[PDB]
Design a binder for this molecule. Sequence first.
Ligand SMILES: CCCCCCCCO[C@@H]1O[C@H](CO)[C@@H](O)[C@H](O)[C@H]1O
Ligand SMILES: CCCCCCCCO[C@@H]1O[C@H](CO)[C@@H](O)[C@H](O)[C@H]1O
Ligand SMILES: CCCCCCCCO[C@@H]1O[C@H](CO)[C@@H](O)[C@H](O)[C@H]1O
Ligand SMILES: N[C@@H](Cc1c[nH]c2ccccc12)C(=O)O
Ligand SMILES: N[C@@H](Cc1c[nH]c2ccccc12)C(=O)O
Ligand SMILES: N[C@@H](Cc1c[nH]c2ccccc12)C(=O)O
Ligand code: NA
Ligand code: NA
Length: 504
Amino acid sequence: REHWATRLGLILAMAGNAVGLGNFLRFPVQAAENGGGAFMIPYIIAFLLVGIPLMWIEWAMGRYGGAQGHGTTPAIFYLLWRNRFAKILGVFGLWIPLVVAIYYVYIESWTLGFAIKFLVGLVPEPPTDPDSILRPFKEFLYSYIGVPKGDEPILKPSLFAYIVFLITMFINVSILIRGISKGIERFAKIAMPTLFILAVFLVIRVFLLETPNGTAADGLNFLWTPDFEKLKDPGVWIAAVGQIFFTLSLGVGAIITYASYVRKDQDIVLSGLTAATLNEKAEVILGGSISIPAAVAFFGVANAVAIAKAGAFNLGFITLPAIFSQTAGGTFLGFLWFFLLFFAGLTSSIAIMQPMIAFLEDELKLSRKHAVLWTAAIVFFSAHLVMFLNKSLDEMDFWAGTIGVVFFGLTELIIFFWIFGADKAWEEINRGGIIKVPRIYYYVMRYITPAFLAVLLVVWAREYIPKIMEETHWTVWITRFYIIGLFLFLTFLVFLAERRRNHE
Ligand SMILES: CCCCCCCCO[C@@H]1O[C@H](CO)[C@@H](O)[C@H](O)[C@H]1O
Ligand SMILES: CCCCCCCCO[C@@H]1O[C@H](CO)[C@@H](O)[C@H](O)[C@H]1O
Ligand SMILES: CCCCCCCCO[C@@H]1O[C@H](CO)[C@@H](O)[C@H](O)[C@H]1O
Ligand SMILES: N[C@@H](Cc1c[nH]c2ccccc12)C(=O)O
Ligand SMILES: N[C@@H](Cc1c[nH]c2ccccc12)C(=O)O
Ligand SMILES: N[C@@H](Cc1c[nH]c2ccccc12)C(=O)O
Ligand code: NA
Ligand code: NA
């Protein structure tokens, strides 16, 4: 079986998986919509009681399975619990990263697309007023994506947006087809430093920003001013736990597969803890010091609220681009911005596709070349539903990316720490550990963490699913139909995998 060459590589790869567009976009927005500085209370609490606990578990499971030639949950779940229902539940852990990938690479292709357009200075040029500046860029984005102009839920991406998507896929293939060490690990060692560098620069530059409407200091101030009255709101503790789950890429299956290439006795406690720490610093320190400070510096705190409610997407692809077109060398700044995000996405998309690759290699005995190519094929084809059908992206992101990950996280906890055996799991976690997990996490993982994930799934599902299932256009069934098919497909492959094992 393949393995990570170095300890630095492993950590950087794992960290690259967790660091994404969310670090520089979603976090700042959430933190602002949930009490600024006060949001650090439920955020930190969730990181210690959910993020870290679950993270180690996925490392543990991943490594556990890797020692037996299995890097995916259909087999790993079976190993932790020899029951056919464990194989079916394991399929769900392979379905999620596949579906997510189907829409994520495309999203990533956007950043590469914009980075290019900005680099070469092919962008809108206002003109005065905010609406006047924003509209040109709002339309710049809409033209790229192909936002519907009619009542038909049809998207029509630009030829350029399509071609860039092909290139993005090609870049992912190039890295993946070289394997774990010479491909993923190798690229991580370059991407992370480049990422960190680009972030730092952007941080410095933003702090210099001064307009009649305000400064970067105003933005940071607003963002970090604690509103201790919002902590009462349960919806805040839900946004916090959700933000941690998101930023750590938990329940997505990526971590398990990466961890399956960790040697039988190679530490996962310190390695995992460090990987997480890296992501956190990139999120709060860097991510919180760019987008929002910039938006507030340019539009004044008078719109800090509105802009925050406008969403992370608008913030990263519309508002900031517009801000850049009004600052000195802003166009080359936009480049660095989207360049930053592209590497943020890339280090995740390669991780989000490895699971499907690992399955083909481990269970169907496909060469790495064939596995990667077929995986690229499946995702590339499937992506066309996301590119051309409006709101398909949202549907996949919901069931798989959102619902799926929280449900699966709870499943992991229970199978590992309850079915498999708490003590067995605990030793399975601490074994080979450079450092040992504080004896207190035993109870956290066994009761506290599952309890949390349950409340999150439940309290949140009550005020979520009803909408999607009722207040949506009928075309959502196209997407639901397709992704359900993918689940069937994967269930079939698993069937074929277990039949092959019996034959040999
Ligand atoms: C089925 C797998 C192969 C892809 C089938 C071709 C569909 C892609 O269609 C492409 O869409 C782009 C974006 O709207 C357009 O700009 C291009 O003109 C068009 O060729
Ligand atoms: C590598 C990324 C740049 C290459 C992609 C360029 C393709 C988009 O090029 C576009 O093609 C359209 C259809 O022919 C024309 O109508 C547009 O004028 C032209 O800009
Ligand atoms: C030099 C390598 C990169 C070439 C950049 C090609 C991408 C340009 O893309 C072009 O942008 C124009 C203005 O936004 C649009 O009007 C065209 O429809 C679009 O194809
Ligand atoms: N970790 C990503 C979010 C994320 C969660 N699961 C994923 C799966 C694939 C890609 C990204 C993700 C971020 O910080 O923004
Ligand atoms: N669905 C969320 C993003 C997301 C994906 N997976 C998640 C897990 C937890 C919280 C949020 C997410 C959004 O619309 O932005
Ligand atoms: N468990 C120790 C020693 C060890 C066992 N197997 C390893 C494989 C690689 C590196 C170290 C090890 C560690 O992770 O450091
Ligand atoms: Na992150
Ligand atoms: Na990444």
